Design a protein around this ligand. Structure first.
Ligand SMILES: Nc1nc2c(ncn2[C@@H]2O[C@@H]3COP(=O)(O)O[C@H]4[C@@H](O)[C@H](n5cnc6c(=O)[nH]c(N)nc65)O[C@@H]4COP(=O)(O)O[C@H]3[C@H]2O)c(=O)[nH]1
Ligand SMILES: Nc1nc2c(ncn2[C@@H]2O[C@@H]3COP(=O)(O)O[C@H]4[C@@H](O)[C@H](n5cnc6c(=O)[nH]c(N)nc65)O[C@@H]4COP(=O)(O)O[C@H]3[C@H]2O)c(=O)[nH]1
Lengths: 822, 45, 144, 144, 144
């Protein structure tokens, strides 16, 4: 090869070229690849002035501007990638300080405008201060006027241009009022989304139902009923979380003589002691007088270890010989012996906090008919949607939305249902209702409903005061969700909340809306396979031009997403609720349907659906050229729909990657102050990154001098007390130091759990660290989630489809290699 | 046909309809705010 | 300089040229491609100091105003200067009627939505490249 | 050894060649491809010293000006020297009016826009290469 | 013993051979493939002695001039020998006018352009290989 170049090139330039070629080949390039790369390099130097300082700077930053182009490894079709990226760079947009300051001032003024308006309306309060009859008549007539204007806004026929302009204006309204703190803006957006969704549903029901074929009519009805169900559920959910009460804890009487006695039940059937230990150690730290508290341990295993543990930590143990009605039966048996005015069921894993029994017990003495006060559930361990997807402390848990906003909203209508554990029930009403519900599997909601039907109210507190171990497998999380679904279904089949006496209609609405999520499998399946009615069969489900569909359906989705992102802000990232639903919407559906009338089990339906949608996308690619130029945008819309379904299914597959887990103790990554002291009199600070049940983690600033066999005394400071416990250096790998906690006696464990786990301040800063809900941030993240799921399935699928998924994933990666990046 | 009469009075009128919709949205949000605040006070106390 | 980082872009004048494009599309314009292109070149000319950049924008404002006036179908300054006294002496009702007939609410709505869309696009996509490409396309079509 | 830096391009005369190519494309110029490629060969042919390079450009400035003048259809300056007395005998106001009438502002606008275009496109397109390519093509056309 | 280090190519005579090629295309020369190929072979001989290299330069320069002259259709030495007395008395202006008429400035422009082209191409592509190959092709064609 060198001889030909030397015959063509002078030894200086020949040496330069040979060096460049060898540099290309050293990085794993082929002969053909490096040859074509050299040809492209020489052409580029011919045309583009790489010696110009602009191009010196551009080459210097070649990594950032061209993340998908590896300079050291040339590849075939590199000029196509370069052209695409450079065209985007010219297209893309790259004294900005003054403009940023002006924009920030504008944002601050918009945010504070409701504040100033509220101050003006409050100091000049003077809204209901007129005469009763005139006030009622005025409210009625004004409501009728508003409803008439809404009706004319909903049903008005519009042509493409008019519809587009209306959409844009109302979206601008939604965007402007979205950045408006308070609780009034939520009502504004709820009303606006209700009007827009009524407009869309009316359009679908009055202009776009195809009556020309007995084949495109039944399918259209199915899709329209799916959308009607979705709209009904959205409206009931809006009613559910319309105005969270933000209930405030009541300070208890200063004297400690009128306070009641609290009985704490910790039920256990098969859990090991290694999880109950921390809960009972933090329970002993509860800031309550020790003569008016009873912490109980109940063991369905008949185990002696819990007996010994309870005896040596100073709490009570009771076990039963006969196990009937599972948790309900065990808790009732415990209540039979609980000589206390209150019963507070704590889970076998949710660690109580010291300021629990006083931050939730004032209302039981203020409101004299209260019967249940539930407390939020916060999971410190990664749930199966966090560990498998690498989404720990980056995406909130499934229950974050519920326990942060939905039950606070339910508190307004008095429908906050017992959530399994972590709640206080006054025993006087509990004796009247017969105890814990034993019929169904969801004892909690049934017991709460039975309490509510007797007139006794219920409460809720927002502060996270209970941390527990999240689900450790996707199968077990599916089992938990399916148990909730089956229990609610059994409740409805046995006791309909809608038909009763003594309940406000709002309570019935909250109860039924809590049971519209467990029938939401059929609509999900219908939506997923809906585009397989025009691409596979030939049926116009929505008898309308493709621009009109994109102009009526689109406002509904955009306004619903915007409103929900505003109301459920730092609780549920967008498009993840869909992923959770479709993960559930194959196994919760069969039980409810029966009631109405990789993995060979977990992820078979995902494989079925991805195969069907891939057949659909292939046939759609067929129809794009064979189809008439009129019926062209319909294929484009249906292909976008199938692509969305494919992203959904890829995410569903991705969630099912059960990763390696050998950490015996789940690590809670929080920053707390600690210190280390050696046998010299000098104290060294340390930066603590995380702790666990039997360990810790500290990064010493400087790493002065320690070894793997030296003894270091660890000093833990809380408030104004310093605590000393023996620690052993476990890992020494530079700035990261490993520690292992030896087994201890009772008091040492109480002090340690109070110093690390049961701190009622860490979860607040944790919630402060939650990333804001951002649609665009979700986009690439969810796309990568789907791609990872597809790749994993391609790895662990049957061979006959392993090849198919392999070639498909290869094509996807090859195409994404060309797509520009910022 | 009166409904068609009003429609034709606003078939090419999406902007006035949008503004009237905004006005009704504000009014309905206001009445809902009143009722919800009253219910909230009647519940909490 | 080495790289001349004085090609900052048209910045605000993107709306100016987009409004001119819209008014030419509607059919109300006697568009002048050469003068529009020279105005774009004057707006995009690189200048070292920021003071001269600000002065260039300030001097371009009245010239841009005059160019936009010249590109419309409205009468020239001679008629305005000759009929200002008559307009002042006219009754208020005639002036109000003329003002009402002058303003088209559809035009105002289109211009406002164009401004909002320009705000969004400038927040996302660089507009100067598109504006100059359209100006070059118009000039090439006209001269050919 | 930075010997390449003796072959830099005709950056600074790329505007010269682009203006002349445009003027030819509008038909206002009497073109000689051989002479133009001779001038391009002069420009791209190095000199041993940067001082010698500056001297080359100082010598080429009269040469470039003369080539631009003679390439245009203007009469020879010897006639101007001979008839300067007759021109001075004519009225000066008429001469001023005539020279104000002669200047075409459309070509001046095109020249200004081309200057801005060159000063921006000297990054993504090298202009000495393209100038010499078009010059070679025109020479080939005038040879065959 | 490193004889291969002295194979630097035809070097300075590449311009001479390309000049002859350009003339032959222009037809102002009667080419002698035998004599010129003999000159090429004479230059081909590698000699390690640099003083002998200077001597071979001093021998080739008259040889090169003689070959270039004799390859011209110009009148032979007999005619100038006979008419030197008459020609020497005439003014050099007539001689230079006749030279310019016989050899036009097109040839000198091509020579300047080809000098620039050869100088720049003798920093990227081995010119001697191609020049020798084309000389061999010319000799082969003239043989048949
Ligand atoms: N032998 C040992 N090394 C320890 C221990 N604690 C910390 N390290 C070291 O510190 C790193 C901790 O990574 P991370 O931030 O938890 O982030 C981790 C974590 O997200 C995940 N990961 C790796 N191994 C495990 C594991 O065994 N269990 C779990 N749950 N995640 C793991 O991958 C990331 C990279 O971890 P590594 O590459 O292993 O790098 C590990 C490892 O080198 C320990 O108890 N034993
Ligand atoms: N926070 C923290 N704790 C530390 C660290 N080093 C040691 N420990 C504590 O000491 C125990 C023993 O870990 P090991 O001897 O490294 O033996 C480890 C190691 O072989 C492996 N392992 C656990 N986590 C990781 C990990 O992230 N990366 C790797 N590479 N191995 C891990 O599993 C064994 C059991 O570890 P664990 O169950 O976590 O239980 C750990 C943990 O409680 C450290 O850097 N950070």
């Amino acid at each position: 090869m060198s001889i030909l170049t030397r015959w063509l090139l002078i030894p200086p330039v020949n040496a330069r070229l040979i060096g460049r070629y060898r540099d290309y080949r050293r990085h794993g390039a082929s002969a053909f690849s490096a040859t074509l790369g050299c040809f492209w390099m020489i052409l580029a130097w011919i045309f583009i002035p790489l010696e110009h300082p602009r191009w010196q700077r551009i080459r210097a930053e070649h990594k950032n501007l061209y993340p998908h182009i590896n300079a050291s490894r040339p590849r075939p079709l590199d000029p196509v990638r370069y052209l695409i990226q450079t065209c985007w760079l010219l297209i893309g947009a790259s004294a900005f300080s003054g403009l940023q300051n002006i924009r920030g001032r504008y944002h601050q003024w918009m945010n504070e405008l409701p504040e100033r308006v509220s101050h003006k309306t409050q100091h000049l309060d003077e809204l209901g201060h007129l005469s009763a009859g005139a006030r009622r008549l005025i409210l009625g007539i004004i409501v009728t006027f508003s409803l008439i204007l809404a009706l004319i806004c909903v049903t008005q026929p519009f042509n493409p241009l008019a519809q587009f302009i209306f959409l844009m204006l109302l979206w601008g309204v939604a965007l402007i009022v979205r950045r408006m703190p308070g609780r009034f803006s939520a009502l504004m957006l709820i009303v606006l989304s209700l009007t827009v969704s009524c407009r869309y549903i009316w359009w679908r029901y009055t202009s776009t139902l195809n009556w020309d074929d007995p084949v495109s009519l039944v399918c259209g009805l199915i899709l329209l009923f799916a959308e009607t169900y979705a709209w009904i559920v959205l409206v009931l959910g809006y009613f559910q979380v319309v105005w969270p009460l933000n209930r405030q804890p009541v300070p208890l009487p200063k004297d400690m003589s009128l306070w009641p006695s609290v009985d704490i039940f910790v039920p256990t059937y098969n859990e090991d002691l290694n999880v109950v230990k921390n809960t009972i150690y933090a329970s002993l730290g509860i800031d309550w007088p020790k003569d008016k508290l009873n912490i109980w341990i109940l063991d369905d295993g008949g185990r002696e270890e819990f007996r010994q543990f309870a005896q040596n930590v100073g709490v009570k143990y009771i076990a039963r010989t006969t196990h009937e009605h599972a948790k309900a039966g065990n808790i009732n048996n415990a209540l039979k012996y609980a000589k206390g005015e209150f019963v507070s069921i704590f889970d076998c894993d949710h660690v109580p906090t010291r300021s629990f029994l006083q931050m939730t017990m004032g209302w039981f003495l203020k409101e004299k008919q209260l019967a249940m006060m539930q407390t939020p559930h916060h999971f410190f361990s990664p749930d199966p949607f966090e560990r498998n997807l690498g989404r720990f402390r980056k995406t909130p848990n499934e229950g974050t939305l519920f326990y942060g906003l939905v039950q606070d909203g339910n508190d307004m209508w008095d429908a906050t249902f017992f959530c399994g554990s972590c709640a206080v029930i006054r025993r006087k009403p509990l004796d009247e209702i017969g105890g814990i519900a034993v019929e169904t599997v969801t004892e909690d909601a049934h017991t709460s409903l039975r309490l509510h039907r007797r007139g006794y109210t219920s409460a809720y507190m927002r502060i996270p005061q209970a941390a527990g171990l999240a689900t450790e497998s996707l199968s077990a999380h599916i089992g938990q969700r399916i148990r909730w679904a089956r229990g609610m279904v059994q409740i409805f089949r046995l006791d309909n909340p809608l038909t009763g006496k003594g309940l406000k209609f709002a309570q019935r609405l909250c109860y039924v809306n809590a049971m519209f999520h467990f029938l939401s499998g059929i609509p999900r399946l219908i939506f997923l396979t809906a585009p397989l009615a025009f691409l596979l069969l030939h049926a116009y489900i929505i008898y309308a031009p493709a621009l009109m569909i994109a102009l009526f359906v689109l406002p509904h989705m955009i306004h619903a997403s915007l409103t929900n992102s505003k109301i459920q802000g730092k609780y549920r990232h967008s498009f993840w609720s869909e992923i959770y639903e479709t993960v559930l919407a194959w196994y919760i559906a069969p039980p409810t349907l029966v009631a109405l009338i990789v993995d060979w089990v977990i992820s078979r339906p995902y494989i079925f659906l991805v195969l069907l949608n891939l057949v659909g996308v292939a046939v759609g690619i067929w129809r794009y050229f064979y189809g008439p130029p009129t019926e062209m945008l319909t294929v484009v819309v249906s292909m976008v729909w199938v692509f969305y379904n494919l992203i959904v299914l890829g995410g569903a597959v991705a969630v099912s990657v059960e990763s390696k887990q050998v950490r015996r103790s789940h690590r809670v990554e929080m920053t707390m102050p600690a210190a280390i002291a050696r046998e010299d009199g000098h104290l060294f600070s340390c930066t603590v990154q995380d702790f666990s049940d039997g360990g810790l983690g500290i990064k010493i600033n400087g790493q002065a001098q320690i070894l793997e066999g030296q003894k270091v005394n660890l000093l833990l400071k809380r408030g104004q007390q310093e605590y000393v416990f023996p620690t052993q250096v476990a890992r020494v790998m530079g700035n990261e130091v490993g520690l292992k906690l030896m087994p201890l006696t009772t008091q040492q464990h109480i002090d340690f759990v109070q110093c690390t786990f049961a701190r009622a301040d860490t979860w607040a800063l944790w919630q402060d660290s939650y990333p804001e809900d951002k649609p665009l941030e979700s986009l690439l993240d969810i796309l990568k989630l789907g791609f990872r799921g597809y790749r994993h399935l391609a790895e662990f699928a049957p061979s006959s489809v392993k090849g198919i998924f392999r070639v498909l994933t290869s094509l996807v990666s090859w195409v994404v290699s060309f797509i520009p990046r910022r | 046909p009166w409904f068609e009469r009003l429609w034709y009075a606003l078939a090419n009128h999406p902007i006035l309809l949008a503004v009237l919709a905004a006005i009704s949205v504000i009014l309905l949000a206001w009445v809902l705010w009143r009722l919800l605040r009253i219910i909230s006070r009647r519940r909490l106390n | 300089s080495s790289l001349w980082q004085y090609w900052r872009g048209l910045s605000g004048w993107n709306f100016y040229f987009l409004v001119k494009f819209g008014l030419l599309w509607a059919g109300y314009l006697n568009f002048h491609p050469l003068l529009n292109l020279v105005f774009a070149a004057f707006l995009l000319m690189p200048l070292p100091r920021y003071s001269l950049h600000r002065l260039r924008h300030w001097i371009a404002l009245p010239i841009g105003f005059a160019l936009f006036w010249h590109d419309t179908w409205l009468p020239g300054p001679e008629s305005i200067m000759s009929q200002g006294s008559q307009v002042a002496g006219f009754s208020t009702d005639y002036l109000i009627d003329l003002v009402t007939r002058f303003i088209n609410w559809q035009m105002i709505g289109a211009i406002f939505v164009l401004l909002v869309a320009w705000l969004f696009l400038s927040q996302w996509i660089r507009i100067t490249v598109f504006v100059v490409a359209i100006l070059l396309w118009l000039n090439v079509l006209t001269l050919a």
